[PDB]
Design a protein around this nucleic acid. Structure first.
Lengths: 425, 100, 85, 139, 61
RNA sequence: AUCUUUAAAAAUAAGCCCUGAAGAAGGGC
């Protein structure tokens, strides 16, 4: 019996120019799993299937390693040298298991293991398109609008889809028009092939610059980071390979115009063309535009920075509803804090007396120590008291003894108090 | 048969790039290329003050010159027309096409 | 734009907090920055295998064959064999 | 010293040379397609065919002529200026017949009105350093 | 009145259903009865593209 | 119609109030 499953399964197959060499492995893992349950210890088997005569011969499989972990599984290599010397370490020695029929019932685990393999092969060629066009700009004709998502037609009945948060916030749709997108990061989601097309993710703006600017197709200029707000404002960072080329002047055009055309493609999208620097600090100074940066103290180990702005352009440095500080806190890679020059002055006066008070937690003899703290800081216990050459040759006299006193109290203080409070069990 | 293609532009890199794209497309889709030829750079002007009172700024009134080309093609197939249909032409360039 | 004026109306209630908490200032939280640099560029090899003229016309749609072959077999035994198990 | 039909013939020549530079076909094919579409018929066609054959059959020589300039500039053209510079390097390396400052000047006044954005200070910076080229006499 | 009548694409008003510019439209600004062509202005990419099309290739507004 | 010296900068938009120091967080009309 069945006797028809092979005819109908050579009827389904050869649909992507490979008839038998996926269903070889499907019958391998299909029939190899069936004898796992009837003999209840550890029995791994492999079959050799032939399509011509219909008879199938299964073969006994034993694992060849050096020691016996769980019994009877291991041929224990020196016995594998006797039956066939061509068999080596890594493959299994063939022994015959007596079974020749088409099969007894089950005969059905075959049927939907076939239904499984055609679906994951479908998934494989859907992934093959997901390699061929990620990421391109392609566009399609609207078919259906199911009140949260929408349906496209990209040509040859290639149906796509667009989410809610994946749009510009106020879009209108008519069944028939075409919208462009980059595509995307793959979910299946169910058994099928769906394609979420984006217009609010940054890669839409980026690939619009790629078609718009031809120097990206010439590798003259080089774009680094992109921060957006899908209907209000964007900041995108460019550099150039040759120092004579101006990437900003290449990205604006005449008269507007590239940021004007890509802007009118995405509504009221403001585009800030900004230069990328190798310096982490100066790229933020470029990125706060159109602010006038007074001074920035860059704080390491947390990716944080502090920004002060003089006068008048405070709400333009932060932006309306924090948009300049948010998009600027999205472009670079370091967290930003925008304050005044007087809040920066009170910040330094706060951190100085704060370091003084956290050093009043230590032993803290008379006021000359705090004078050293105001003059030469070196806060947070001198960064484990490791500074070179008498704090780079400061003069109060006191060459050897007093610096050994402050390094002795420093190392003993951080040792005792840091092991007392900072070190956990 | 023609399609005839005439293109207008403000920047020369986009129209040289774009005509290279169209000629490369017509060469790949199995058809023959007629042209392309250039035409003289027609100058124009249009006074745009984005600001108040008339000429206290002493700067230019946003003048520009205009480049334009033309290219033809004879005996195409359906692969050519859905090929040029699927092709996403860049913005800022005007396409004055024909067909017949 | 217009509204959010009411927190600038409350700048004195901010000033007593800056008098009480001087080491804290205005802050801005910080999301998904790490893959927006790598997905900003191929730089060019994606529109070299995609190559804006030539490789949407040459390589247009390739799982469109497999999806028509997929459902039509479990459809095909029922529509073909007949309703008359 | 020449009729104006030669001055119109170079104006047709940049258009016929642009078509071979872009279409990448055979030269006899592209002039065989070119000669039936222009309707300003004051063209000295012997110099026209002589120049199209001249830049047609040539070579590793003319990029040797512009090679001391593309050692100074990045190797990026400038397509109408590629046409005007290649025809200028052919007529400055073939034409002992016609004079030498005419075909520079009407092709730089032609190249300013027909080429890219500025395109005349560029070529005026080219052909002065291209005057000490292999032709030694400055006749 | 759920208010739809489309049958309509970004041009104003026709229906093209052949060749490249199918499911698009425009106006025949210059009618050629002798040549049997209709110069229809397709609004692709936010831009008019006046293309000459046949009577059977379009549907008249 | 026989010399004119190495290519050009853009946003003018998001309604009204309460809690909160918030341009962190949420509510109302």
């Amino acid at each position: 019996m069945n006797k028809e499953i092979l005819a109908v399964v050579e009827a389904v197959s050869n649909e992507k120019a490979l008839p038998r060499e996926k269903i070889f492995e499907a019958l391998e893992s299909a029939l190899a799993t069936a004898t796992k349950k009837k003999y209840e210890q550890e029995i791994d088997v492999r079959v050799q299937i032939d399509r011509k005569s219909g008879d199938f011969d299964t073969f006994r499989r034993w694992l060849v390693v050096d020691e016996v972990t769980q019994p009877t599984k291991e041929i224990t290599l020196e016995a594998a040298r006797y039956e066939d010397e061509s068999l080596n370490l890594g493959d299994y020695v063939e022994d015959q298991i007596e079974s020749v029929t088409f099969d007894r019932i089950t005969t059905q685990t075959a049927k939907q293991v076939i239904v499984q393999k055609v679906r994951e092969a479908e998934r494989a060629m859907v992934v093959d398109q997901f390699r061929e066009h990620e990421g391109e700009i392609i566009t399609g004709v609207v078919k259906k609008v199911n009140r949260d998502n929408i349906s496209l037609d990209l040509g040859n009945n290639a149906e796509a889809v667009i989410l809610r948060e994946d749009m510009l916030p106020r879009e209108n749709f008519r069944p028939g028009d075409r919208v462009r997108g980059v595509l995307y990061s793959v979910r299946p989601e169910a058994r099928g092939a769906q394609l979420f097309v984006t217009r609010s993710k940054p890669e839409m703006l980026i690939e619009l610059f790629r078609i718009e600017v031809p120097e990206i197709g010439e590798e003259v200029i080089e774009i680094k980071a992109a921060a957006r707000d899908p209907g209000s404002r964007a900041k995108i960072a460019v550099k150039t390979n040759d120092k004579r080329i101006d990437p900003v002047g290449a990205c604006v055009g005449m008269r507007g115009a590239r940021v004007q055309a890509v802007s009118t493609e995405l509504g009221g999208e403001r585009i800030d063309i900004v230069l990328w620097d190798d310096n982490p600090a100066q790229f933020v100074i470029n990125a706060m535009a159109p602010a006038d940066v007074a001074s920035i103290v860059v704080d390491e180990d947390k990716h944080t920075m502090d920004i002060a702005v003089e006068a008048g352009n405070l709400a333009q440095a932060i932006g309306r509803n924090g948009q300049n500080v948010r998009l600027a806190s999205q472009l670079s890679g370091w967290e930003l804090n925008v304050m005044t020059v007087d809040d920066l002055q009170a910040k330094h006066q706060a951190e100085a007396h704060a370091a003084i008070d956290t050093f009043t937690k230590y032993l803290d003899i008379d006021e000359d120590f705090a004078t050293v703290l105001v003059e030469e800081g070196f806060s947070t216990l001198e960064e484990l008291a490791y500074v070179p050459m008498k704090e780079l040759l400061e003069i109060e006299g006191l060459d050897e003894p007093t610096v050994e006193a402050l390094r002795e109290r420093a190392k003993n203080a951080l040792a005792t108090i840091a092991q007392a409070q900072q070190e956990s069990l | 048969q023609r399609i005839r293609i005439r293109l207008k532009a403000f920047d020369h890199r986009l129209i040289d790039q774009a005509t290279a794209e169209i000629v490369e497309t017509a060469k790949r889709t199995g058809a023959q290329v007629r042209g392309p030829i250039p035409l003289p750079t027609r100058s124009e002007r249009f006074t745009v003050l984005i600001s108040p009172h008339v000429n206290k700024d002493a700067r230019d009134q946003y003048e520009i010159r205009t480049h334009l080309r033309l290219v033809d093609i004879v005996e195409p197939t359906e692969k050519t027309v859905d090929a040029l249909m699927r092709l996403d032409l860049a913005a800022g360039v005007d396409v004055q096409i024909s067909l017949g | 734009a217009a509204q959010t004026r009411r927190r600038e109306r409350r700048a004195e209630k901010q000033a007593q907090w800056k008098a009480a908490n001087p080491l804290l200032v205005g802050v801005s939280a910080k999301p998904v920055n790490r893959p927006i640099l790598s997905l900003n560029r191929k730089p060019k090899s994606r529109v070299e295998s995609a190559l804006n003229p030539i490789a949407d016309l040459t390589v247009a749609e390739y799982h469109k064959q497999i999806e028509s072959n997929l459902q039509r077999i479990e459809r095909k035994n029922q529509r073909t064999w007949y309703s008359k198990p | 010293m020449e009729p104006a039909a030669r001055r119109r013939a170079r104006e047709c020549a940049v258009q016929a040379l642009y078509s071979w530079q872009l279409s990448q076909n055979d030269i006899a094919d592209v002039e065989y397609q070119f000669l039936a579409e222009q309707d300003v018929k004051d063209v000295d066609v012997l110099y026209f065919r002589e120049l199209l054959a001249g830049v047609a059959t040539n070579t590793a020589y003319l990029d040797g002529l512009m090679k001391p300039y593309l050692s100074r500039l990045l190797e990026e053209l400038g397509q109408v200026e590629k046409a005007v510079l290649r025809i200028a390097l052919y007529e400055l390396s073939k034409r002992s017949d016609v004079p030498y400052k005419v075909a520079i000047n009407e092709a730089i006044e032609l190249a300013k009105s027909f080429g890219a954005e500025d395109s005349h200070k560029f070529v005026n910076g080219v052909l002065d350093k291209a005057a000490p080229v292999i032709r030694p006499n400055k006749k | 009145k759920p208010r739809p009548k489309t049958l309509f694409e970004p041009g104003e008003m026709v229906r093209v259903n052949d060749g490249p510019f199918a499911d698009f439209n425009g106006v025949v600004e210059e009618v050629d009865y002798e040549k049997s062509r209709l110069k229809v202005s397709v609004s692709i990419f936010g831009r008019a593209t006046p293309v000459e099309l046949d009577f059977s290739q379009v549907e008249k507004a």
